[PDB]
Structure formats: C-alpha cells, structure tokens
From a paper:
The chemokine receptor CCR5 plays a vital role in immune surveillance and inflammation. CCR5 exerts its physiological functions by binding to multiple chemokines, such as macrophage inflammatory protein (MIP-1α, also known as CCL3) and RANTES (regulated on activation normal T cell expressed and secreted, also known as CCL5). Here we report three cryo-electron microscopy structures of Gi1 protein-coupled CCR5 in a ligand-free state and in complex with the chemokine MIP-1α or RANTES, as well as the crystal structure of MIP-1α-bound CCR5.
To facilitate the formation of the CCR5–chemokine complexes and improve complex stability, in addition to the mutation and truncation, the chemokine C terminus and the N terminus of CCR5 were connected by a 12 × Gly-Ser linker, which resulted in high protein yield and homogeneity. Additionally, a disulfide bridge between the receptor and chemokine [T16C (CCR5)-T15C (MIP-1α), E172C (CCR5)-F28C (RANTES)] was introduced to further facilitate structure determination (see Supplementary Note for disulfide design). Using the optimized CCR5–chemokine proteins, the cryo-EM structures of MIP-1α–CCR5–Gi1 and RANTES–CCR5–Gi1 were determined with an overall resolution of 2.9 and 3.0 Å, respectively. In the structures of MIP-1α–CCR5–Gi1 and RANTES–CCR5–Gi1, the N termini of the chemokines adopt a ‘hook’-like conformation, which is stabilized by a salt bridge between the only negatively charged residue in this region (D5 in MIP-1α, D6 in RANTES) and the positively charged main-chain nitrogen of residue S1. Additionally, in both chemokine–CCR5–Gi1 complexes the side chain of the N-terminal residue S1 forms a hydrogen bond with the receptor residue Y2516.51 and the main chain of the third residue in the chemokines makes a hydrogen bond with E2837.39. In contrast, the MIP-1α residues A4–T6 approach helix VII due to a spatial hindrance caused by helix II, with their conformation stabilized by interacting with D2767.32, M2797.35, Q2807.36, and E2837.39. For instance, the MIP-1α residue E29 forms a salt bridge with R168 in the CCR5 ECL2, while the counterpart in RANTES, Y29, disrupts the ionic interaction with the receptor. Similarly, residue Q33 in MIP-1α makes a hydrogen bond with residue K1915.35 at the extracellular end of helix V, which repels the positively charged K33 in RANTES. Induced by the interaction with the N-terminal residue S1 of the chemokines, the side chain of Y2516.51 shifts downwards in the chemokine-bound active structures relative to that in the inactive structure of CCR5–maraviroc. This movement results in a rotamer conformational change of W2486.48, which is known as the ‘toggle switch’ of class A GPCRs39, subsequently leading to the outward rearrangement of helix VI on the intracellular side to accommodate the G protein.
Numbering used by the authors:
A (entry chain R): 1 to 69, 112 to 409
B (entry chain A): 6 to 55, 182 to 233, 241 to 354
C (entry chain B): 21 to 340
D (entry chain C): 27 to 61
The structure:
C-alpha cells in the first residue's frame, strides 16, 4: 500500500488449457492489490495471458523465460491517466506544506525549546517521521505520472522509509496521547515519570518496532518491467499470498482505527473528565473543542483509508471483482492515501502550532 | 591530548550532574510565602512534617514541596522579587483578625495587589490563606466590619464578611483568565490545610502541562 | 564650589578627537549548562576562567578558552544574585538572598570543593561583592551597607554606612585601595578600605542605581541607572563629565563594564541586548544582540581580550 | 577639586595612550585571537 502501488493489470480468470512456450515472450508479476495471485505472460502481440502460480507448468515457464534474461487482464491505464490529471500538484503542495511545517517545528525545538520536556522529544521524533514520509512523497508523485526511473534496491529503500515514517508517526501520536494522559490524570506521578532519558528510550523502542513492522513490506516489494514502463510493488509468494495480504491490511488497520482510536478515547476521556477542575469556561471550552477537532480530523483522514484497504483485500466479501469497480476502488485508495498524507503533514500544526508557548517560540525565532 | 580529553570528560561529568540536579528540581514543587505582617505561614508550618529566606521542605502524597518565607528582607521588594520567577505558586497568608488593627488590612490588600499585578508573576497562581478564623468570628460578631470596608457585606455576619473579604481579595487580580486564585480558610487540622495546598499545586501543574503540550 | 570648578561639557572638549565609528562583535563562544536564570559573573586576571551565578543552586567555573566546566559547587541557597572571582583564582565568593557570603576554595585535594568561610550577620541580601585580596573581601548588603571581611577571622574588619537607599553594586579601583558603591537612592559614594568612611558622594540620577564600574585609568567611573542613562563621574574633578541617554532605549540597565583601553563602555540593558558606547564622544558604537532574555551580567577581561555577557535566558556568551 | 577640562584631558590622554592595547577597538587576526 505504497502510493497505492496501483498495478497495470489485475485479472481474475485463469486458463483451463495449456499455452505454448513460443507464445510467451515476457513475464510480469501481479501486485498485491489483485484479488488473486497471478502472472501475466506478454506474447509477441500486445495481447496478454494470465496464469495462476499454483500450477506446476507455470513455474517451468516463469523460470525458463528469466533464465534467458486466454483472457485479457483489465488494464488499469485509465486509473493512471485520471491520476495523471491531478495527482502531481496535490502531492507537491502536500509535500511542501508538510516539509515547511516539520522544518519549522524541528528548528523551533532545536533553538528555543532545546528539548527540555519529553513532549519535546516526542514532537521532534514525530516531525522526523513526517519528514521521512515527505521525502518519499514526491518520489511517488514522480512515479504516478511516469515510469519508475529507479532500481529495485532504490524503491525497496524508499518503501522502507515510507512505511517506517508512517508507522513511527502513528506510534508517536499514541505516545503523545499517553504523555498528555499522564500529565493530566497523574501529574504528580508524571513529575517523576516524565524524564528525557525515558523519552529517548521509548522513542528508540518505537523506532525499532516501526522498522520491525516495515521489514515485512521491504522484503516483499520489488521493481519489475511491465512492457515499456517499470513499476515497483509488493508481490507475495503464491503459497500464502492472501494470508500475507490479510496480515498487511490487518496491521495498518489495527494501527489505523483500532489502537490509536482506543488510546484516544481512553486518554482524552480522562483528560476531559479532569478538565472539570479547571473551572475556566474560556479555557475548558477551547480544550474540549481542540480535543474534538483532533478526534474528528483523525477520523475524517484515516477512516476512509482503512475502509478502502479492507474493501480491496476482502473482495469475496462485498464482491467487487468487476475491473471497473476495481478502478473506482483504486482511485479511492489513491485519494485516501493522499488524505492520510494531508493528515500526517497537518499533524505538526495541530499538535504543536495550536499551543501558545509554541507560537511564542515561533515568533521569537522569526524576529 | 590527554589533558584536553580529561577536561572534556570532567565537563561531561559536571553537565550530567547538573542535568540530574535540574531533573530533581523540576520534580519537586517550589512554593512561595507572602504576608503583610507575618509571612511565616504558621498554619502550614504547624504540620508535623515541616537566614534571610526561610526554606521549608516537606513531602506529601508522593510530592515534595519547598516553601520560601521572605520576611527578613527589609529592603525594597521590587529589587529581589524577580529572583523568585518560575515558582509553582505563591501562598499569600492574610490574618482575618487583622482587619481592625492599625491600616494593616489595607497594607495587606495593597501588598496583594502589587504582588498579583506584577510582570514577573503573571503565570504563577496564588494560594490565598485566611488565618485566625475562630478569632475572626469573635471580632466580627463583637466589632463591625465597617471599620475596614465601607460596604462590610451589608449583613455584617461571619459568613457574609468572609465572602466579601474573599471577593475583595479576588478583585485585585486583574488577570482573571491568566491567573487563578485558590482561596481557603485555615482549619484546626493541618491535614486539610496541606490537602488544599496539594490540590492547588496539582491544578497549577495541570495548567502548566496543558500549556506545555498545547491544550491551553 | 562644585559649580565653580565647571568649565564646559566634555563633548565640547573632545569634539576634536577622531570617532571610533561603527564596531561589530561576533559571538566566539556561547556557554550553556545552567538550568536557571543567570544573574552575576566575574572575570579572572588570566582571562581563561570565569564564574557565573544561576538560580539552579549550582555554581560552575567556565573555561572560556575551551568552553568547559572546571569546578561545580552545589549551593544551599538557590536564590543567588551575586558572585565574585578572586584575582588569585583560589577563592570564589557567592552570596544571594540568604544573607550569607560563602567562600569556596577552588584549589583543593581530590577535587573536593567545600565552603572556606561563611560570612553572616547581614540584615539585608547580598547585592554585590568583589575581592580586595585573597583574605580581604568587600560585599554589599541589603541594609544600605557595605562590609569588608577577613577570611581567617570571620569578623567585620570594616563597615561602610551612610546610604539612604538599598545598596546594589560596588566597584573596585585597579589600585585596590579605594572603591565606589551605588545604591537605590540615586547616589554613587566613594569609600576607602583603610579610612573606613565616605570620602565623596556623587548624585545626579532620578531612579535607582544598580551598576557601576571604574575607568581603567582609575580616576573616573561610570554608573548604571534604571532610567536608560549612564553618567560618568571623576574622583578628582568632583564633576559630572558626561551622560548617556538615547530615545530608542527607555528600559533599565543591569550591568556596566569598561574595556581594556576604556574607549568603549559596555552596558547591559533590559531590551534583550547590550550597548557599547564611545567613552568620550558620547555616542553609540555597537548593539550586541543574541540574548533571549534581559542581559543580567556583563564582564570584561583584565587584558580586554573579550567580553562575556550573560542573560536570564540561561545563556552567557563571549564576544570579540 | 580640579577642572572638568583637565579631567577630560587626562581621560582622553589615557585612552589615546592605551588605544594600541585595545583588542576591542583593534580587530586582531585569528592567530592573535584565542577566542
């Protein structure tokens, strides 16, 4: 689920007959977005053939063709040429906005804040995660409109960086929520619990958990030539492909709308309960409004992405095997991933810039 | 460069110890005492836990509080009041019985107004304490409150006089939204008086943490 | 009479000299590590080790050449606003609101720094302090008084009184025989460590005085007030020679220090920056900026190699 | 007591005699600057 990694073709019908070897000119591996695993044989003509890797003969041909160097799959070219309509400006403006915001936050924390609190360490780590995301964003913007101009190891490292940034930002949001919970409900306990060394320890553990979750995506992703153009995507082995697919679409979902949302409704609930002790209407109303804004923004910017992922994975359930419905679902996945990019690029302005002490540091750095 | 490396490692030792001491200071709570005639806060000092500045340390409910009594400083207050910038809260003790003695209540009020409306203590709160309540009852039902306040709460009873004194003390805080004053009347049991201090300190820490994270 | 000895203003006299012109100092070393607001500092004769006072209850010796910490001393009184570094480099004096002047021995075995002596009996707080010698030491108390102490004796060798307002600062002459003291009563008074009384009193201010420094020649001294002005007085002329006051600055002054040649007079203001003026021409020469909070402490090395400026923002930096 | 003119003369003379030994006024090179 990197840049929606929309494959050129996903086909759902196999062959019941044998195809000769002389009619097999090139081989292509279907991405993980397909409902079922398959391999596409490009013949002498532009017409292509599909085969399921569960066969015994398909292995023989897919090996013989690469040792040297039926039905037609529904080409997902309209998806790209509609993506080519307005993907690039959207990706570019999101990238530049998030980049300037994250550099602002990091420079502020370095100059004015000097990392005095554990919240500062968490904010710096979240900004670094967003920066890692935004470093990969334009590289995928350049792949949406044109063929992949990089190699296998390059797109693999880029996938690694992308998923590392995503998972680390998702975990650091939870870490900031837990820090706020410990500061509001257990302030006298947080005075001895919130330490910078514990913050760095939890940040390192979060980074290693994020990279450990990303490694399944890194090893199961490669770049291959589909005709003239190149594409890098996730290709799981046909032995347990669906299973791995499920695992993939489970993990993000488990970290998309289950774990962070429960952490939020557990922590911010107690925060709002304790806010009754504030006895300041102008402050209490603003705090509840900010909490509700964070909740609703996280929902509006993450729920459609996990929903569309669940749509694309479980195709037997709510059957959408029609390739036109597949094109609509892929466009929905693209727009929802871009919505998640907007969420990650506006999380700095919603977690830091809303604070008055942060705005003071910013205006001090400005002058 | 053995000497240079030794000096750098000694600087690292000193910086590590300084960071540890700073964490210790941030963990503990620093409180301030102020009063017209007696800022020693005998009500709080009477607790069993317990030369110009008097330092009193006591841990309550897994929280250490340091209190600084400033009474031996007969010099100008504005010349050294900036040193206490950054404290948790200021505990202002006012004797309720010191309302008819002479101007003393007026001096306490002007001191409270000058301290609360100071540019160096805008964010810090004020834990106001009213001492001598049992004697205040005798004084208020034996002598009228018109001596100090022209309005004197109208009814001129203990409850009304205490309420009017509290509202008048809160009237001096021009920074209503910025600064919140926690007013309390001292009790015979020191445990309730220290529990109020703990609650006020917890509220101040809540405000500070919400300003740190960004909710406030 | 005082007005009889007046010839003219100093600017009319010095209008023939060549102006220094625009001067800009760059930050060489920035010293960090104090987890509180920094108030006072002092320089050494070797121009390598300096002292700094901060509200964190810890006083650390700064190695300005390598930007490192040499000695660290925990303080039982976190409310400190004065500190002095002895020219011999063996004793460091620390005061504050505790009314106690603690002397710390820098050179001891096994790096064990302990209080050499505790000077008590001060009715008011310690506002300023400087070292006459390793054993003779002067301090300014908060009861409008100055006290000259002996280390090994522990008694008041000399007591200077006569100020109506709270004494804030003192300055020692290069000859280490006479000194000056500035108080809140808008007065700068001369005292002798041997005679033990006020020899001359200099007035001409409207607000409190909190900064003072001798000229490198020793016959003049500038005073720092809180109404954005710095007046220069002479010991022999009994005359106010010159006054610094500008329309852009209206805030107070915290520290005043002279350079090696004395041609440049530095003063830390409350406008989050320090100002370097020309000694004679009475015009501004430089604006040192870069401190987040108000510049509290200002010091110049005895040889005038560089200038240390420290603010309430836990930041003290070296300019040259 | 002396005149304010003689005092200013002594001050400016001490300044001009010591103007050479002024690291603030005279920008010293990096080889001559410990800082």
């Amino acid at each position: 689920s990197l840049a929606a990694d929309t494959p050129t073709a996903c086909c759902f019908s196999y062959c019941s007959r044998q195809i000769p070897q002389n009619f097999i000119a090139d081989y292509f591996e279907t991405s993980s977005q397909c409902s079922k695993p398959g391999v596409i044989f490009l013949t002498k003509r532009s017409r292509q053939v599909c085969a399921d890797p569960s066969e015994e003969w398909v292995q023989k041909y897919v090996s013989d063709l690469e040792l040297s160097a039926c039905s037609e799959p529904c080409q997902k070219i309209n998806v790209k040429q509609i993506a080519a309509r307005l993907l690039p400006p959207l990706y570019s403006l999101v990238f530049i906005f998030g980049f300037v915001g994250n550099m602002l936050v990091i420079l502020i924390l370095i100059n004015c804040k000097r990392l005095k609190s554990m919240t500062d360490i968490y904010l710096l780590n979240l900004a670094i995660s967003d920066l890692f995301f935004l470093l990969t964003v334009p590289f995928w913007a350049h792949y949406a409109a044109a063929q992949w101009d990089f190699g296998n190891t390059m797109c693999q490292l880029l996938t690694g960086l992308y998923f590392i940034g995503f998972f680390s930002g998702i975990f650091f949001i939870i870490l900031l929520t837990i820090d706020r919970y410990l500061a509001v409900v257990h302030a006298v306990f947080a005075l001895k619990a919130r330490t910078v060394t514990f913050g760095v320890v939890t940040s390192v553990i979060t980074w290693v958990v994020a990279v450990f979750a990303s490694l399944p995506n890194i090893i199961f992703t490669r770049s291959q030539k589909e005709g003239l153009h190149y594409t890098c995507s996730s290709h799981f082995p046909y032995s347990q492909y669906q299973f791995w697919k499920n695992f993939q679409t489970l993990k993000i979902v488990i970290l998309g709308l289950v774990l962070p949302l429960l952490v939020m409704v557990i922590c911010y609930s107690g925060i709002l309960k304790t806010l009754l002790r504030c006895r300041n209407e102008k402050k209490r109303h603003r705090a509840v409004r900010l909490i509700f804004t964070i909740m609703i923004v996280y929902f509006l910017f993450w729920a459609p992405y996990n929903i569309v992922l669940l749509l694309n994975t479980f195709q037997e359930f709510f059957g959408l095997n029609n390739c036109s419905s597949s094109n609509r679902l892929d466009q929905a996945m693209q727009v929802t991933e871009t919505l998640g990019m907007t969420h990650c690029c506006i999380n700095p302005i919603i977690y830091a810039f809303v604070g008055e002490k942060f705005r003071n540091y910013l205006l001090v750095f400005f002058q | 460069s053995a000497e240079d490396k030794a000096a750098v490692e000694r600087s690292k030792m000193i910086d590590r110890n300084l960071r540890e001491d700073g964490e210790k200071a941030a963990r503990e709570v620093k409180l301030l005492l102020l009063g017209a005639g007696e800022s020693g806060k005998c009500t709080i000092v009477k607790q069993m836990k317990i030369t110009g500045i008097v330092e009193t340390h006591f841990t309550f409910k897994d929280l250490h509080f340091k209190m600084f009594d400033v009474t031996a400083q007969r010099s100008e207050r504005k010349k050294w009041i900036h040193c206490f910038e950054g404290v948790t809260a200021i505990i202002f003790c006012v004797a309720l019985s010191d309302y008819d003695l002479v101007n003393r209540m007026h001096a306490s009020m002007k001191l409270f107004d000058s301290i609360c409306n100071n540019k160096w203590f805008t964010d810090t709160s004020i834990i106001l304490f009213l001492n001598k309540k049992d004697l205040f009852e005798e004084k208020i039902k034996k002598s009228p409150l018109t001596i100090c306040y022209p309005e004197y709460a109208g009814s001129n009873t203990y409850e009304e006089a205490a309420a009017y004194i509290q509202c008048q003390f809160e009237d001096l805080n021009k920074r209503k939204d910025t600064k919140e004053i926690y007013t309390h009347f001292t009790c015979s049991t020191d445990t309730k008086n220290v529990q109020f201090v703990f609650d006020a300190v917890t509220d101040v820490i809540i405000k500070n943490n919400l300003k740190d994270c960004g909710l406030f | 009479a005082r007005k009889a000895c007046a010839d003219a203003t100093l600017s009319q006299i010095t209008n023939n000299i060549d102006p220094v012109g625009r001067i800009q100092m760059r930050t060489r070393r920035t010293l960090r590590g104090h987890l509180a607001k920094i108030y006072a500092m002092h320089w050494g004769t070797d121009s390598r080790l300096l002292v700094s006072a901060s509200q964190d209850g810890k006083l650390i010796i700064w190695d300005s050449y390598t930007t490192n910490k040499v000695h660290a001393i925990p303080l039982r009184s976190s409310w400190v606003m004065t500190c002095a570094y002895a020219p011999s480099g063996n004793y460091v004096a620390c005061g504050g609101l505790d009314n106690i002047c603690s002397i710390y021995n820098l050179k001891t075995r096994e790096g064990n720094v302990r209080v050499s002596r505790e000077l008590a009996g001060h009715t008011g707080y310690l506002s300023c302090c400087r070292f006459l010698d390793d054993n003779q030491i002067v301090t300014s108390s908060g009861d409008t008084t100055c006290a000259l102490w002996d280390i090994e004796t522990g008694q008041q060798t000399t007591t200077f009184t006569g100020h109506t307002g709270d004494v804030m600062s003192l300055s020692l002459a290069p000859d280490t025989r006479l000194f000056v003291s500035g108080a809140c009563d808008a007065s700068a008074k001369l005292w002798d460590v041997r005679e033990g009384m006020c020899r001359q009193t200099f007035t001409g201010h409207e607000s409190d005085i909190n900064a003072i420094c001798f000229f490198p020649n020793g016959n003049a001294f500038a005073t720092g007030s809180d109404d954005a002005t710095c007046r220069l007085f002479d010991l022999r002329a009994d005359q106010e020679l010159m006054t610094y006051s500008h329309d852009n600055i209206i805030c107070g002054i915290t520290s005043v220090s002279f350079s090696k040649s004395g041609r440049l007079l530095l003063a830390g203001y409350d406008d989050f920056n320090c100002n370097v003026w020309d000694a004679l021409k009475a015009d501004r020469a430089g604006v040192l900026a870069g401190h987040d909070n108000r510049v509290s402490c200002l010091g110049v090395t005895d040889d005038g190699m560089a200038v240390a400026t420290g603010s309430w923002d836990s930041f003290l930096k070296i300019w040259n | 007591r002396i005149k304010v003119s003689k005092a200013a003369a002594d001050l400016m003379a001490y300044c001009e005699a010591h103007a050479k030994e002024d690291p603030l006024l005279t920008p010293v090179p990096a080889s001559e600057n410990p800082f």
